[PDB]
Amino acid sequence: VWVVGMGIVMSLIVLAIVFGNVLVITAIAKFERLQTVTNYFITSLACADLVMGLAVVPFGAAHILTKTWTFGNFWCEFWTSIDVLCVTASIETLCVIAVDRYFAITSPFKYQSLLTKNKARVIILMVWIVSGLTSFLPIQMHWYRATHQEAINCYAEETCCDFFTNQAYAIASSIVSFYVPLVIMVFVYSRVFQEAKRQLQKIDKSEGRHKALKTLGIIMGTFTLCWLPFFIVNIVHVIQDNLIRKEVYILLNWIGYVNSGFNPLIYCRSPDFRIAFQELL
């Protein structure tokens, strides 16, 4: 009496995720003043989020509400590979943006020489290649498959799709996709905040006659709150099988996806972007 009609809540996520990234891409591409070395990371992240909005969410919604995977097994493997690829690419692009901000702030004179039109292409291509080798190579080769009887029963039957993964693959994927970027971004942002505080003290020293905390809080909190809860259960549920149920795992995984829709609000607030949005509509 309430399961069927509540498809609007899942459809709104798809609509918002598509719309935000579409506007970001259109604003960057069509408008002359928005093209900058930093903006290429933004457009790569926007494309990665658009792939999630167009591929993984619509099929997952059907698989959940219908409780039956109508399609075959090849599409199941392909969809899982797409999911892993997009997630890791998005997180590593966030890490790349953070490191670029660190270089921009800490070394003002020599920022120009390090990043240019040439280096952005190479770094983006290497990030996407690293993301691709994590997902497609182990999943498609069938090297990640489990061993217990339940996994065999699930993988033999075509109509059932569930994620059963070996301990080593889970640990390796979690480490390569989440923790290293988290440590890098934490160190970078702490250093940047310390620099900002030092500059504020320096100016107050002579001009005698908050904002950084708020910005850092938003940037760190949205990412950590959206995804950290997932990888914790991802690592725990393989070490000891009795603890974590499947429903909790699914809920945390779907909570992680919503972070894709919040990226345009977090990373696109410049007055130039506002002018571009106003001109489009």
Site residues (vs ligand G1I, CB under 6 A): 83-84, 87, 163, 173-174, 177, 253
SS3 238: helix
Of residues 177 and 263, the one with the C-beta less far from ligand G1I: 177
Of residues 100 and 237, the one with the C-beta less far from ligand G1I: 237
Report how far residue 28's alpha carbon sits from residue 14's, in angstroms, rounded to the nearest whole number: 22
Say if residue 83 carries a ligand binding annotation: yes
Residue whose Cβ sits closest to ligand G1I: 173
Query: Is 43:121 a contact under the CB 8 Å cutoff?
Result: no
Say if residue 135 carries a ligand binding annotation: no
Say if residue 257 carries a ligand binding annotation: yes
Q: How far is the CB of 251 from ligand G1I (least distance, A)?
A: 12
Contacts of 182 (CB under 8 A, 6+ apart): 224, 228
Q: How far is the CB of 184 from ligand G1I (least distance, A)?
A: 17
Report how far residue 58's alpha carbon sits from residue 138's, in angstroms, rounded to the nearest whole number: 24
Q: How far is the CB of 135 from ligand G1I (least distance, A)?
A: 8
Instruction: Give the residue ranges of DSSP H helices in the chain.
Output: 8-30, 37-65, 73-106, 111-114, 117-141, 149-156, 167-174, 180-206, 211-239, 246-257, 259-267, 271-280
Q: How far is the CB of 84 from ligand G1I (least distance, A)?
A: 5
Q: Which two tokens stand for residue 226?
A: 């959206």
Q: How far is the CB of 15 from ligand G1I (least distance, A)?
A: 21
Query: Is 127:181 a contact under the CB 8 Å cutoff?
Result: no
Say if residue 272 carries a ligand binding annotation: no
Say if residue 173 carries a ligand binding annotation: yes
Report how far residue 84's alpha carbon sits from residue 163's, in angstroms, rounded to the nearest whole number: 12
Say if residue 234 carries a ligand binding annotation: yes
- Indicate the annotated binding residues: 83, 88, 173, 234, 253, 257
- Indicate the annotated binding residues for (S)-carazolol: 83, 173, 253
- Indicate the annotated binding residues for (S)-timolol: 83, 88, 234, 253, 257
